[PDB]
Tab-separated table of C-alpha atoms in Angstrom:
chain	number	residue	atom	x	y	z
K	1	UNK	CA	-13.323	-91.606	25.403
K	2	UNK	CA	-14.757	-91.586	28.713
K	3	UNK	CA	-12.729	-93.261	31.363
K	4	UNK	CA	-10.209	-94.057	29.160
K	5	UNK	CA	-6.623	-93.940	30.385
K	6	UNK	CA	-5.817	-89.926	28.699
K	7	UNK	CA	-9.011	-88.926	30.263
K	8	UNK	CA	-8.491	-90.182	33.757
K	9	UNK	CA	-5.485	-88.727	33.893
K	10	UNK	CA	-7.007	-84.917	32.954
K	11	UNK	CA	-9.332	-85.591	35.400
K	12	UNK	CA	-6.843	-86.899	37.980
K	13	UNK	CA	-4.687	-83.144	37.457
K	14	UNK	CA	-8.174	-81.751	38.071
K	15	UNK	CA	-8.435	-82.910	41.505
K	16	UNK	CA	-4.557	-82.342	42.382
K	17	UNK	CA	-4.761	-78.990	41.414
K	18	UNK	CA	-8.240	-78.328	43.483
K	19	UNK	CA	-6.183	-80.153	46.237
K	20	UNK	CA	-3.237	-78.034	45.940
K	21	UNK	CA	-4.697	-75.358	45.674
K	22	UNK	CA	-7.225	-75.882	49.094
K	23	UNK	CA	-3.828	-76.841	50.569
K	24	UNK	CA	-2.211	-73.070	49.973
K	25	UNK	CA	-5.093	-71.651	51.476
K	26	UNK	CA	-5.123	-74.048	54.381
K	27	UNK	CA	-1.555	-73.211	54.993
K	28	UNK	CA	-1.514	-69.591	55.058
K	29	UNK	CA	-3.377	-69.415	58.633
K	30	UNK	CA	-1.085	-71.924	60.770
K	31	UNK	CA	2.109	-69.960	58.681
K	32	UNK	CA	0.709	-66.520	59.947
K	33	UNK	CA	-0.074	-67.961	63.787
K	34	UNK	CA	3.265	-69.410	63.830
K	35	UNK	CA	5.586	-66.401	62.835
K	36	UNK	CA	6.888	-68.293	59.559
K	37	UNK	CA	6.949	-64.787	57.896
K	38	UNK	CA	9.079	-66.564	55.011
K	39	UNK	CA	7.537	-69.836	54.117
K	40	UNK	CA	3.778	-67.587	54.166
K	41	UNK	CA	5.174	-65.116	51.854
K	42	UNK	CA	6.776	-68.882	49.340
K	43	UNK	CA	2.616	-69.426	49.054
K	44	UNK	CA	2.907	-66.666	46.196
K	45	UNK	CA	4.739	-66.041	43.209
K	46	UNK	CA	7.454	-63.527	43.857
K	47	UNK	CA	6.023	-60.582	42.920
K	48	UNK	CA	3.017	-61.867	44.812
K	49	UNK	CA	0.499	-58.978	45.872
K	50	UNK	CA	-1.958	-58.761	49.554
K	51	UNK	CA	-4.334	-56.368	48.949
K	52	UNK	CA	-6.511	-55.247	52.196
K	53	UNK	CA	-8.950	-51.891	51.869
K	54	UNK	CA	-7.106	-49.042	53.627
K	55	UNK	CA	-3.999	-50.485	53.728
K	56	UNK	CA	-0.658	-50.286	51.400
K	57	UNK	CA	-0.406	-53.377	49.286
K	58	UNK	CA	1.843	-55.391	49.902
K	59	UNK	CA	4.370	-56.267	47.115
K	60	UNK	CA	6.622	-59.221	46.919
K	61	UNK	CA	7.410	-61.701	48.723
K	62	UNK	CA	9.407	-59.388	50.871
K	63	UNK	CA	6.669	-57.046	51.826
K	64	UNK	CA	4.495	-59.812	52.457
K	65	UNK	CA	6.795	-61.635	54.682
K	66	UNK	CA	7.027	-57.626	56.601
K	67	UNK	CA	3.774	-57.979	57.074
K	68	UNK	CA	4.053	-61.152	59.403
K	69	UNK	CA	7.649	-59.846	60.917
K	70	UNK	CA	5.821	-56.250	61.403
K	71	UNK	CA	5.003	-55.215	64.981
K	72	UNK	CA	1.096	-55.239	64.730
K	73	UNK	CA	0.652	-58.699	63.278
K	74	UNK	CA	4.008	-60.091	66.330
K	75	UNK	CA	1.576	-58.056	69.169
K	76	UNK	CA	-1.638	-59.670	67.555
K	77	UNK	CA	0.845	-63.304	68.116
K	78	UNK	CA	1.641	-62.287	71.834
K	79	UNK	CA	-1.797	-61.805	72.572
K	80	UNK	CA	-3.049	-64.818	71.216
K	81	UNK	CA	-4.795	-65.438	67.617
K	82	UNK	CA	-6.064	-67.912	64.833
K	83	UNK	CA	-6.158	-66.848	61.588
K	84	UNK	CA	-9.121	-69.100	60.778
K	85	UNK	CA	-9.980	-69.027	56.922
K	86	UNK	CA	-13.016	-71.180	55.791
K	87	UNK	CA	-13.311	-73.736	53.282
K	88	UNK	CA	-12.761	-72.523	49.480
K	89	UNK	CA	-14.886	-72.317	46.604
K	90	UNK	CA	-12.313	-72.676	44.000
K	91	UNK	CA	-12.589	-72.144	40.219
K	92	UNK	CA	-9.754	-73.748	38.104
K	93	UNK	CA	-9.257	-72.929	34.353
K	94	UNK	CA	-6.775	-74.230	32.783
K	95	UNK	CA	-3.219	-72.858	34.699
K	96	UNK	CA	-5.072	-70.355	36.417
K	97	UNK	CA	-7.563	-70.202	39.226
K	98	UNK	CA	-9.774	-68.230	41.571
K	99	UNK	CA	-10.936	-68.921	45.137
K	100	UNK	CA	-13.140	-67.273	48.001
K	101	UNK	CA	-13.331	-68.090	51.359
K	102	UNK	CA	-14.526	-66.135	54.483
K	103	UNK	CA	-11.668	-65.019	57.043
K	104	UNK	CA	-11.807	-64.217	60.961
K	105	UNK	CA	-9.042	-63.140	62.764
K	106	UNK	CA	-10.067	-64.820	66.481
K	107	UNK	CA	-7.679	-62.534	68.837
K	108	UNK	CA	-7.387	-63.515	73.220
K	109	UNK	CA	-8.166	-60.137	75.425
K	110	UNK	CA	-8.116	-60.414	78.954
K	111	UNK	CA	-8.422	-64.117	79.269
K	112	UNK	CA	-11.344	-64.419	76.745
K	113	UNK	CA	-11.799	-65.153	73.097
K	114	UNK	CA	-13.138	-62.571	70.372
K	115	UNK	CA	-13.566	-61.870	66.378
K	116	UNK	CA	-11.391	-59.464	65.630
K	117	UNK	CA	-12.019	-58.854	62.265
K	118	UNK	CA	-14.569	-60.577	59.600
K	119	UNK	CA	-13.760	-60.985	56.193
K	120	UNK	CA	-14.035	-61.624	53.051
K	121	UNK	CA	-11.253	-63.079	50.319
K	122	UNK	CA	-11.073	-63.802	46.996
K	123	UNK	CA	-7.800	-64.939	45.687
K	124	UNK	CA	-6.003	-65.733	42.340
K	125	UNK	CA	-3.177	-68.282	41.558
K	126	UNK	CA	-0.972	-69.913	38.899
K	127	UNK	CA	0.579	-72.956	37.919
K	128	UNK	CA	4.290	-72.554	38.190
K	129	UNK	CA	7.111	-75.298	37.318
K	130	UNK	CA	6.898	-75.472	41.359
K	131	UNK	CA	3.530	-75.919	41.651
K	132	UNK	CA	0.362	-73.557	42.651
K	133	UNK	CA	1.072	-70.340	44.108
K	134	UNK	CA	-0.678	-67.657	44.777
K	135	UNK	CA	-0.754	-64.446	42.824
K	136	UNK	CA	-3.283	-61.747	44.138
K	137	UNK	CA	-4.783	-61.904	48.054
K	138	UNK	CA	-8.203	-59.320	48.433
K	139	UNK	CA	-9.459	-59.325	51.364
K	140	UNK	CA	-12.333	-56.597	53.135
K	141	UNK	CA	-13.861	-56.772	56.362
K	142	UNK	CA	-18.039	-57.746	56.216
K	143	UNK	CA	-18.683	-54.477	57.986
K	144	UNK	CA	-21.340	-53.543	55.426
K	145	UNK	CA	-18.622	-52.754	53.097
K	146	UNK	CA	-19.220	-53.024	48.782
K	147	UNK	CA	-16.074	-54.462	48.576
K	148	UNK	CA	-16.351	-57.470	51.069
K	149	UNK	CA	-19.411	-58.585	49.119
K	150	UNK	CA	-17.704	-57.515	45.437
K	151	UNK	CA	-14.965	-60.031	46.748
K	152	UNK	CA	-17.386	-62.780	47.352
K	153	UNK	CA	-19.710	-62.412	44.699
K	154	UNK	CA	-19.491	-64.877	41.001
N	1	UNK	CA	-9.114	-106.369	39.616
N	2	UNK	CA	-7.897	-103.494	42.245
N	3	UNK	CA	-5.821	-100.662	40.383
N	4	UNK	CA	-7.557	-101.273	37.067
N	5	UNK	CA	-8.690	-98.907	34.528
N	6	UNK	CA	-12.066	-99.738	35.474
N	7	UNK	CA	-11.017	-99.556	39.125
N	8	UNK	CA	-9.695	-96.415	38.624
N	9	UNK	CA	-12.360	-94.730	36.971
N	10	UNK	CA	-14.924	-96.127	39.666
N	11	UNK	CA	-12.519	-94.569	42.808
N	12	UNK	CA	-11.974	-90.969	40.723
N	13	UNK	CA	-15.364	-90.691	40.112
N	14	UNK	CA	-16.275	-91.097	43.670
N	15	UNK	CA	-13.682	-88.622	44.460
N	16	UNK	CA	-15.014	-86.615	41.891
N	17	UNK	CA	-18.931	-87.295	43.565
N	18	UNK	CA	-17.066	-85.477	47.404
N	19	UNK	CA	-15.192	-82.867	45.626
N	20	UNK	CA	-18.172	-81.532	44.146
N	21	UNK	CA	-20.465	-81.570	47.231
N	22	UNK	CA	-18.047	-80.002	49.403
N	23	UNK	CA	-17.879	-76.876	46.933
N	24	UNK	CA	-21.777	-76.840	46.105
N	25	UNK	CA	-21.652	-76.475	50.742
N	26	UNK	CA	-18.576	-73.891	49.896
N	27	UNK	CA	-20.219	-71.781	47.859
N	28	UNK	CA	-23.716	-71.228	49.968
N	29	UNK	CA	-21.802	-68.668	52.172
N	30	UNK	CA	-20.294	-66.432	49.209
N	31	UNK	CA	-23.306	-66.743	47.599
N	32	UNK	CA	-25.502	-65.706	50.210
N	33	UNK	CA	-23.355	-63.148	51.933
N	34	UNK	CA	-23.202	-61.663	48.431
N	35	UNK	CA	-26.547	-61.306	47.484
N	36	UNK	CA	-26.936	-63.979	44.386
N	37	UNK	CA	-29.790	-65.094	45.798
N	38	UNK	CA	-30.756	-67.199	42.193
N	39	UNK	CA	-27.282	-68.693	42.204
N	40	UNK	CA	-28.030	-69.878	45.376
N	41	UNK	CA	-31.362	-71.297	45.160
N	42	UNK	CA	-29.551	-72.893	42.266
N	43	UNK	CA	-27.890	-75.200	44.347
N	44	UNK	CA	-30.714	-77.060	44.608
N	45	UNK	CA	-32.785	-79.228	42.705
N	46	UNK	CA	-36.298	-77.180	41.380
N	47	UNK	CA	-38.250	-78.635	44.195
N	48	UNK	CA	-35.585	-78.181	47.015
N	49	UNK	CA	-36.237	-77.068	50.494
N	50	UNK	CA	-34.622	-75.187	53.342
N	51	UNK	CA	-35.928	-75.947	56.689
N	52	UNK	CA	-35.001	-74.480	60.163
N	53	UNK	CA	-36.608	-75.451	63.509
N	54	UNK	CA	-38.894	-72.576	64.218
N	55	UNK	CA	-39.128	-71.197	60.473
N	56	UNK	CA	-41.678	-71.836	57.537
N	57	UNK	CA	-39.616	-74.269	55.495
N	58	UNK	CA	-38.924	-72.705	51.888
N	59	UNK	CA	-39.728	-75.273	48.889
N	60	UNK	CA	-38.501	-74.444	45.810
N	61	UNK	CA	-36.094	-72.430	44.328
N	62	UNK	CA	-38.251	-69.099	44.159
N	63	UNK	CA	-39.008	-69.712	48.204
N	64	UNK	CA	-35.113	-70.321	48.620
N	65	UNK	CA	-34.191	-67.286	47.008
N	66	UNK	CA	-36.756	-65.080	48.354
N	67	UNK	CA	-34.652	-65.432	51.520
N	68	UNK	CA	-31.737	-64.056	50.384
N	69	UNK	CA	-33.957	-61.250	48.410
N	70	UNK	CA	-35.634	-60.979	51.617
N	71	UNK	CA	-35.716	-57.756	53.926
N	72	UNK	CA	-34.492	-60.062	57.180
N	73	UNK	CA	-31.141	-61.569	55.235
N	74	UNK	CA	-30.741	-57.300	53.410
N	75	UNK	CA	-30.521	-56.153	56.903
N	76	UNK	CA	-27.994	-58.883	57.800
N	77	UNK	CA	-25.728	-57.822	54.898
N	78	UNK	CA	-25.860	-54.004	55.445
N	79	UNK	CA	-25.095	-54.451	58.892
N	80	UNK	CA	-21.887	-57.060	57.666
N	81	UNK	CA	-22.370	-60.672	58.120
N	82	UNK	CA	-20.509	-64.043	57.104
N	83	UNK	CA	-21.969	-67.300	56.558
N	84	UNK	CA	-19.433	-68.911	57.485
N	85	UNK	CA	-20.018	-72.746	57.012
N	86	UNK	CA	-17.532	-75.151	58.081
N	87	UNK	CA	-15.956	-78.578	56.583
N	88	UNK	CA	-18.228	-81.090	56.381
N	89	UNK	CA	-18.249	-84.616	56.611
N	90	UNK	CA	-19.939	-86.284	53.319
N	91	UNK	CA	-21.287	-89.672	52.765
N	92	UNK	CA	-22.035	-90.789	49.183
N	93	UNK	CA	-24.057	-93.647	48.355
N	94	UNK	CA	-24.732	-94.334	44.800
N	95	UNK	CA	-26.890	-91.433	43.458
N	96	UNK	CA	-27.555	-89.416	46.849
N	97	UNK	CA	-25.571	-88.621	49.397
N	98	UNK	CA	-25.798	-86.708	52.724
N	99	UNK	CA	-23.208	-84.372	54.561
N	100	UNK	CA	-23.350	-82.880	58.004
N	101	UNK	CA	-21.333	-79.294	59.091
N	102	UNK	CA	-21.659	-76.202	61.739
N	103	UNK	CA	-22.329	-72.522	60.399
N	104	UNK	CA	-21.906	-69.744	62.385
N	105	UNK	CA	-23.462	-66.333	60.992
N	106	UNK	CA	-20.987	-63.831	62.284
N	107	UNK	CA	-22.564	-60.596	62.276
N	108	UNK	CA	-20.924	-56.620	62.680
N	109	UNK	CA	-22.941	-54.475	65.383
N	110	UNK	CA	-21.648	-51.420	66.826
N	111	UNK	CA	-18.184	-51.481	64.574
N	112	UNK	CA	-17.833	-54.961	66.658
N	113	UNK	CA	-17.931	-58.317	65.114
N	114	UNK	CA	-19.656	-61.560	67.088
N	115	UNK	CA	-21.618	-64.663	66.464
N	116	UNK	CA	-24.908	-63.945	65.826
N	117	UNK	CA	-26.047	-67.732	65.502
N	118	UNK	CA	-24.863	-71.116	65.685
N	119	UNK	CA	-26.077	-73.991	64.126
N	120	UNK	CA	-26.194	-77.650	62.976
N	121	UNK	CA	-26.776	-78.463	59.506
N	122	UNK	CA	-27.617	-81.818	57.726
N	123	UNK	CA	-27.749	-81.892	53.851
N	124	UNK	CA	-29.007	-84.240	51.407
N	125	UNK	CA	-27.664	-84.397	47.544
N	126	UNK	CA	-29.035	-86.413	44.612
N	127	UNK	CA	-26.738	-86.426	41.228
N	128	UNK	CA	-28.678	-84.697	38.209
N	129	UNK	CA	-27.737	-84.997	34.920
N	130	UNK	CA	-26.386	-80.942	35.779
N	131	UNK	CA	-24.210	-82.097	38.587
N	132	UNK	CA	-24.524	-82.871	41.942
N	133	UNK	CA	-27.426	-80.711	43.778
N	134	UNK	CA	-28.885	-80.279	47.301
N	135	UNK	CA	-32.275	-81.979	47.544
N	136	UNK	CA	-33.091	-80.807	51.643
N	137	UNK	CA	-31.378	-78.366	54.187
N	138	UNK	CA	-32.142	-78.404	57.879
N	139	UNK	CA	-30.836	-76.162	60.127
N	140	UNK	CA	-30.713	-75.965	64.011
N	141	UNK	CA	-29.131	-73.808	66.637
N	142	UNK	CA	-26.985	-75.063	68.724
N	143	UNK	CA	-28.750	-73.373	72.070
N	144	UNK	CA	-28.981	-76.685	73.536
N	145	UNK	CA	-31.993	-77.758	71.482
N	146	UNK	CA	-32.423	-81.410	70.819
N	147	UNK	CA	-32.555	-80.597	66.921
N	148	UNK	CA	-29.192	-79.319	66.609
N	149	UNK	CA	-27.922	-82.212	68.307
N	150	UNK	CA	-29.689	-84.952	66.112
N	151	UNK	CA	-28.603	-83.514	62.877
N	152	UNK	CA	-24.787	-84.154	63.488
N	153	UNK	CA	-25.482	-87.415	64.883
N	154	UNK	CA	-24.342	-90.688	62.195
A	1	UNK	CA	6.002	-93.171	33.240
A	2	UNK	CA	3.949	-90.250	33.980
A	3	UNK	CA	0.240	-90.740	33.426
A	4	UNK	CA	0.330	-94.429	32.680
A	5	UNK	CA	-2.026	-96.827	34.962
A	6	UNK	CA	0.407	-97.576	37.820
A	7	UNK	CA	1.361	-93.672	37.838
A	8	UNK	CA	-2.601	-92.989	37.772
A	9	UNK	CA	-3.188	-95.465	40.771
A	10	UNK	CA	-0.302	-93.908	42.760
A	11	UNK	CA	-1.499	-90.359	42.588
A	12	UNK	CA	-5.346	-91.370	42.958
A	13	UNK	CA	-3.985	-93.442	46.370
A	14	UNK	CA	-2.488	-89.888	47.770
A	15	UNK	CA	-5.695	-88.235	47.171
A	16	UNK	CA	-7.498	-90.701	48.812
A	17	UNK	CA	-5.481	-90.848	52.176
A	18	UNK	CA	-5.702	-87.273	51.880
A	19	UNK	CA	-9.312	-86.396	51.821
A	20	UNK	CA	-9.710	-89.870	53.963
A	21	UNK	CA	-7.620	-87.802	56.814
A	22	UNK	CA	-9.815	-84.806	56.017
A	23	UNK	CA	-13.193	-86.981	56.988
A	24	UNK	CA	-11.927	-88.107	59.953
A	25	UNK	CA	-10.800	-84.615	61.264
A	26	UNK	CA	-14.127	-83.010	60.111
A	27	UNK	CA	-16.242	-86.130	61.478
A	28	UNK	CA	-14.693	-85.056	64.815
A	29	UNK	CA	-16.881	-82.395	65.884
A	30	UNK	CA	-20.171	-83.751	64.730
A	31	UNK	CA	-19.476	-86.378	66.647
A	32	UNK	CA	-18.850	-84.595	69.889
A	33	UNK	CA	-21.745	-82.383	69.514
A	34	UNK	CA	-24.099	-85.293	69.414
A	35	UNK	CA	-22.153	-86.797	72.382
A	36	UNK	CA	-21.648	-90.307	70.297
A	37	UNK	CA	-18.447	-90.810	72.463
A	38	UNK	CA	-17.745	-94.500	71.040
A	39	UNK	CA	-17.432	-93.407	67.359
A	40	UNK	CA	-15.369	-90.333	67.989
A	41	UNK	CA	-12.556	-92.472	69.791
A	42	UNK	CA	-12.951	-95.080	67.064
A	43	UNK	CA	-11.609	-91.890	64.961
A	44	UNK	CA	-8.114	-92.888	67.023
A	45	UNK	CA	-6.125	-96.226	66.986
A	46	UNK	CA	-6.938	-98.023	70.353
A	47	UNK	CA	-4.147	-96.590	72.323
A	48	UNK	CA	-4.853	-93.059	70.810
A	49	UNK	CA	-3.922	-90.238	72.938
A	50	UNK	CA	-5.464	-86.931	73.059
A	51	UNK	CA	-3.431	-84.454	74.773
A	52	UNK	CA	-4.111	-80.863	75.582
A	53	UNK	CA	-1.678	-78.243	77.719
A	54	UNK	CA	-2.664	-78.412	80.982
A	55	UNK	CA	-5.103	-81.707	81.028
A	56	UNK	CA	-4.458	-85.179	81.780
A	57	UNK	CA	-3.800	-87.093	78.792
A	58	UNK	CA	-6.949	-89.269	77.477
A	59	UNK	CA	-4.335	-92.812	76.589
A	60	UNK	CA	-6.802	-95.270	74.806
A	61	UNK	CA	-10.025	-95.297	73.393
A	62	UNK	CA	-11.887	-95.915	76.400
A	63	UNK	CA	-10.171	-92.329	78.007
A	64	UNK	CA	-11.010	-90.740	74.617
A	65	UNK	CA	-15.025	-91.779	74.875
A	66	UNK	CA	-14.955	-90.961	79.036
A	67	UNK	CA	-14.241	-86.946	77.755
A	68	UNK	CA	-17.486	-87.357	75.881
A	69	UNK	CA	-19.417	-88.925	78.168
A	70	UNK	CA	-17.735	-86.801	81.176
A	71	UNK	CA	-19.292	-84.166	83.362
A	72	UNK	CA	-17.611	-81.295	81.781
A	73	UNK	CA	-18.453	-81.519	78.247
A	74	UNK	CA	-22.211	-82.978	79.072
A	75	UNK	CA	-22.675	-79.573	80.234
A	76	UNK	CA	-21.085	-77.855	77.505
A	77	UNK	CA	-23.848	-79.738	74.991
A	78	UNK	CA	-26.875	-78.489	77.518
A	79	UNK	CA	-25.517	-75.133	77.185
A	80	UNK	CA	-25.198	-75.503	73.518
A	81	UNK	CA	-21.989	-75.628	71.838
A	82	UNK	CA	-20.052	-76.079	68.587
A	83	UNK	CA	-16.920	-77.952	67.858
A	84	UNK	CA	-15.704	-76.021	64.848
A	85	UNK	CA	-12.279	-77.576	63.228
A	86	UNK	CA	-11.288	-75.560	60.519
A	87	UNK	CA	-9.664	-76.544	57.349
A	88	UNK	CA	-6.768	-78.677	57.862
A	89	UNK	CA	-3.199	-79.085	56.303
A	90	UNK	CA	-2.620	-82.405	55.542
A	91	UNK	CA	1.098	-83.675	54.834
A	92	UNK	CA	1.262	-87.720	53.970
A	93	UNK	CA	4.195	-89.956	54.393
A	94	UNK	CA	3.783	-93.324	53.189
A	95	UNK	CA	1.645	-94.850	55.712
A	96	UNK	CA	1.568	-91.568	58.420
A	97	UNK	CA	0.506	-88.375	58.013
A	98	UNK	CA	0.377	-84.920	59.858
A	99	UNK	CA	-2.566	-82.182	59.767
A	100	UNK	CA	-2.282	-79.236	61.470
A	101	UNK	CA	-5.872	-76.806	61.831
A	102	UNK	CA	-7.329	-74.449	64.199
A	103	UNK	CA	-10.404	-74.972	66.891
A	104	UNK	CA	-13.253	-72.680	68.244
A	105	UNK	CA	-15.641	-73.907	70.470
A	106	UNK	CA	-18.405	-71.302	70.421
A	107	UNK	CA	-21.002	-71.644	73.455
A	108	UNK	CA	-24.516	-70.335	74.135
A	109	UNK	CA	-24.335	-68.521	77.053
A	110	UNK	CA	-27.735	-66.594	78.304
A	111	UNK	CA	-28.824	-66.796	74.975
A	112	UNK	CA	-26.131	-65.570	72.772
A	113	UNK	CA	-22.980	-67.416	71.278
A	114	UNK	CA	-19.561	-66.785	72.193
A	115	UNK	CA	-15.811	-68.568	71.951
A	116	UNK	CA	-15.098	-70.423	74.589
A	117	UNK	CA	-11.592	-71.834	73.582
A	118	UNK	CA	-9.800	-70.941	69.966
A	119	UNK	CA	-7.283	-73.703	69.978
A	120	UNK	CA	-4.567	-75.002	67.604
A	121	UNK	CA	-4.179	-78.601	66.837
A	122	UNK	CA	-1.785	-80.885	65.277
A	123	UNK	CA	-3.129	-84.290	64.924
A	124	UNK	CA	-1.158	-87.466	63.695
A	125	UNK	CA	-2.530	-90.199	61.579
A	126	UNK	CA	-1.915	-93.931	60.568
A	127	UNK	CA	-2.502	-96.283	57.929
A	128	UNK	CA	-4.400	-99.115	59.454
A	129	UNK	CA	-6.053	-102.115	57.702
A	130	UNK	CA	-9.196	-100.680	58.255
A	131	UNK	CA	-8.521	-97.043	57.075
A	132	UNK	CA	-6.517	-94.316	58.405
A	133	UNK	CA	-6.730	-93.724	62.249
A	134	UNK	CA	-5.533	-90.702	64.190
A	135	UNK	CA	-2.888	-91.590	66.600
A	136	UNK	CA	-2.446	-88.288	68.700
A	137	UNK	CA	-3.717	-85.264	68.640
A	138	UNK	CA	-2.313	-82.368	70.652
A	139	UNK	CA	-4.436	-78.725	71.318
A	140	UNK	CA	-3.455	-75.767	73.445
A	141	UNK	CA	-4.962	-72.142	73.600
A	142	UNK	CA	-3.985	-69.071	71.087
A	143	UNK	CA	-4.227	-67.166	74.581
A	144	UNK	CA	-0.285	-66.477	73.800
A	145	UNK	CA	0.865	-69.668	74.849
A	146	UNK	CA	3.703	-71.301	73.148
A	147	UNK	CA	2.143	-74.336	72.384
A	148	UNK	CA	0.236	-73.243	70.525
A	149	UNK	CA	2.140	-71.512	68.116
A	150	UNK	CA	4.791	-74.529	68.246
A	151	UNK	CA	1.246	-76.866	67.481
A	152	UNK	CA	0.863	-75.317	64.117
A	153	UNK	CA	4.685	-74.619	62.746
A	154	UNK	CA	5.613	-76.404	60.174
């Protein structure tokens, strides 16, 4: 029945899960800024995959802490940058889900502020026994690209 | 009594009311920056409109998504552009509710991304017996004009 | 138990605080943008404190409302700008909480839009009687600065 006590609580999970989920995505930018190569990568499953067109993938949670340990990302952190990523559309279905948000990599050069890169993401997740995490990251700069919009698109 | 079933039901539902505005906001920018220009007329109720200071306001779905299908907004996405809309703050009263938020259009020129504009938005909702749906959009740019200014304002 | 009505109540509370700390970060920059100085410090607890690297700390609401209604950022509105806050993180212990997010503030300079500052923040919140308050928030530059980077660790 409506509002009834079993019902309230589906709905309830509903909401923690959009919540949780919102919450991974949140997290990822402040992890990346920071340096925290290891708790970033702990937002996915292990075998976790970051996809970006024209680059390897990376694979793991290894590889995808690497990528915040790696030179280019530590000179992108001595410049200065945000990893902003915009609010989510999210998509749950039952312990799976799907999100897109919009991406810019703000970066400092000589003393004033730029966009780096634009982008677009669409990522996957799962309920674990631990909670969300994320499975798949694809992300594609809005440079006129198909896949930026492909990412993007319902 | 506070923490009743009823109780409950009321406070979830209005949880329920926020949680579903913020993604109908969410999704304009995917949407938009990937073409679906129904889906995104379909954000709004039949009779809609989309106004911006210095524009002929579109009313009605067709007029909404005739923007999107519309040479100005296809030049903006084979150049590479984001809609990047920010979090909003929502209000709900009973059936309606309004929610104020920045967009920024960042736009790719030259193999260089920047911020082609910069805005103020208000929107207005109404709950349909579909969902929650936007009833008016204004926009403003946030140049210094007056506009911009009085559509964040509470 | 899990799911029964106390269990229900509990978990609907946390969501609450949560997206009530959400509305008061993303209420923030509306309300600086329309330069309504009195509501944005009543956003903080009365002895607030708003603290950013290299700035006199505003202590109190009154300090908090003279930023708004100061020289500096008077000018900053007649030029045009945005006060973009990002998604936040949001952690909640009993009756205080933590957020962590990023800040632009894009300009209109001779026309076109820029970034004037990309900032982190970490903000702290409050349980009041009358709602959740901030109590400080802290912002420095992603110009390199270690601040910044030590703003958004977890």
């Amino acid at each position: 029945g409506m509002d009834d006590l079993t019902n309230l609580a589906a709905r309830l999970r509903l909401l923690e899960d959009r919540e949780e989920i919102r919450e991974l995505i949140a997290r990822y930018g402040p992890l990346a800024d920071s340096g925290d190569a290891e708790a970033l990568s702990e937002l996915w499953v292990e075998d976790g995959e970051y996809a970006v067109v024209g680059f390897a993938t990376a694979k793991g949670r290894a590889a995808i802490a690497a990528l915040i340990d790696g030179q280019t990302h530590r000179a992108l952190m001595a410049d200065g940058c945000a990893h902003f990523l915009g609010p989510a559309t999210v998509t749950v279905e039952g312990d799976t889900a799907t999100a897109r948000c919009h991406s810019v990599v703000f970066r400092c050069v000589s003393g004033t502020f730029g966009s780096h890169r634009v982008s677009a993401n669409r990522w996957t997740f799962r309920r674990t026994p631990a909670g969300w995490r994320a499975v798949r990251r694809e992300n594609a700069l809005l440079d006129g690209s198909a896949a930026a919009r492909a990412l993007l698109q319902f």
